[PDB]
């Protein structure tokens, strides 16, 4: 396993740590066409669905028909199942908390596939989906939400309960873009929608809508941070800004050199966002500083996972994630936390250095904090050596601490196993 500890790719942008994890590589990369489909996220750590674009499968995979197919694959790139639809074009694909495949048709028809036998439950969107069509949708464990051709939104309390109700009345202005916020990150702990209308930002709640104006040109794609405190909005001018949940002034701004088309725009954490921008990936930090990643594909598609974004490629999967606080303190680039000292002890242990033991006693006063950090950190890793190194870091402190729960360590061990 050469993907067990890919720490060399880590970088600091805007005084924050970011990591690109190459968990898997392919042997069929030259037989893998990723330029003709859109890949969705796997926010519960389930399979990643590859949704084929009927308008792209013309020159390379010339089906040339309105008969959409989705290839559902593991994170290794291995296909688990293939499902084809006879109901016309698919609006998009997401996942449930039980790793169900949630497919929304452009006419509001929804199917929730739960196994390799292609069995599914029934679901639907509001009537506007049939009268005007669906423009876009998002998938949540608390019910699905979608914006319809009349610029109105509908929602349910559960993705398996086909009883759609109006979420928000349609705007009277010109709609440029929108983003849907789940109860997890909303202020009312319910469904909220951000609408960019006539260069004004409207926030639609369950009972009321707020009207707030920000002085910027016509809007583009929108993405909301996983904390409910602020949102990054792109514009057609290339100027990017971040707006708070409570808007008195702008939080941050990022200048451009040229106009871009920031497709598949999503947050990789609470500090930074990832932009597909056709064939080049842009990572924008909290300071406005920009990092770039390069691929030889015709188009790069981003994977809107939970608290991170994966970058699609035929030779490897590049998981680009904002480093979690429990991770920054253990595998961080020069982090001064005692948790990073525990990980140093592990590296010293591998090398049979005496520093492995000294590193533990020197942080005794904060050792319990360092260990708890390593425990939470351990479950957030996707690689075998990284998980073992974080677990060993916790083990070191466990052997010294008189105030530590050794069963929590074991529970973590079983969790990592």
């Amino acid at each position: 396993m050469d993907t067990a500890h890919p720490t060399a790719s880590w970088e600091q942008l805007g005084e924050r740590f970011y990591r690109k994890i190459q968990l898997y590589t392919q042997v069929f990369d030259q037989d893998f066409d990723l330029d003709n489909y859109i890949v969705t996220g796997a926010p519960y750590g389930g399979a990643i669905a590859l949704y084929r674009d009927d308008e792209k499968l013309v020159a390379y995979q010339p089906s040339r028909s309105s008969r959409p197919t989705i290839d559902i694959c593991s994170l290794s790139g291995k296909l688990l199942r293939r499902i084809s639809w006879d109901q016309g074009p698919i609006k998009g694909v997401g996942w449930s908390e039980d790793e169900k495949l949630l497919i929304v048709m452009v006419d509001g028809t929804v199917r929730c596939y739960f196994d390799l036998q292609s069995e599914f439950t029934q679901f639907s969107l509001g009537h506007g989906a049939e009268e005007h069509g669906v423009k876009s949708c998002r998938f949540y464990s608390h019910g699905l939400v979608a914006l319809l051709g009349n610029n109105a939104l509908v929602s349910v309390s559960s993705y398996d309960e086909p009883r759609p109700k109006l979420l928000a009345s349609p705007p009277e202005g010109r709609v440029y873009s929108w983003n849907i916020i789940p109860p997890a990150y909303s202020l009312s702990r319910s469904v909220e929608v951000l609408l960019s209308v006539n260069q004004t930002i409207y926030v639609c709640d369950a009972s009321e809508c707020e009207d707030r104006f920000l002085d910027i040109g016509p809007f583009s794609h929108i993405a909301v941070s996983p904390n409910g405190r602020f949102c990054a909005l792109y514009t057609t001018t290339g100027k990017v800004h971040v707006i708070t949940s409570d808007f008195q002034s702008r939080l941050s701004e990022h200048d451009t050199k040229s106009k871009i088309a920031p497709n598949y725009f999503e947050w990789c954490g609470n500090d930074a966002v990832v932009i597909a921008w056709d064939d080049e990936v842009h990572l924008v930090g909290p300071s406005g500083s920009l990092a770039r990643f390069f691929y030889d594909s015709g188009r790069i598609h981003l994977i809107p996972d939970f608290d991170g974004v994966r970058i699609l490629a035929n030779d490897r999967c590049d998981f680009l994630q904002k480093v979690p606080d429990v991770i920054e303190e253990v595998f961080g680039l020069g982090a001064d936390s005692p948790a990073s000292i525990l990980l140093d002890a592990v590296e010293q242990l591998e090398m049979k250095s005496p520093k492995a033991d000294d590193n533990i006693q020197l942080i005794r006063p904060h050792l319990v904090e360092a260990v708890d950090t390593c425990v939470s950190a351990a479950g957030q890793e996707f690689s075998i050596h990284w998980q073992k190194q974080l677990l060993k870091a916790a083990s070191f402190g466990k052997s010294v601490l008189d105030i530590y729960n050794s069963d929590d360590f074991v529970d973590m061990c079983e969790t990592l196993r």
Partner: protein, 44 residues
């Protein structure tokens, strides 16, 4: 079934009611390991 709620009751009363650490642990551990161990070990 709800072992946790029942342990919470004893935990609320305090450490003294259990008196013998090993006794309470043997009975809790044999029933369920790891998941219930962390609780009974934290309690007293």
């Amino acid at each position: 079934k709800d072992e946790s709620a029942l342990l919470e009751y004893l935990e609320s009363q305090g450490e003294e009611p259990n008196y013998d650490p090993d006794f309470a642990l043997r009975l809790c551990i044999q029933h369920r390991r790891v998941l219930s161990c962390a609780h009974i070990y934290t309690s007293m």
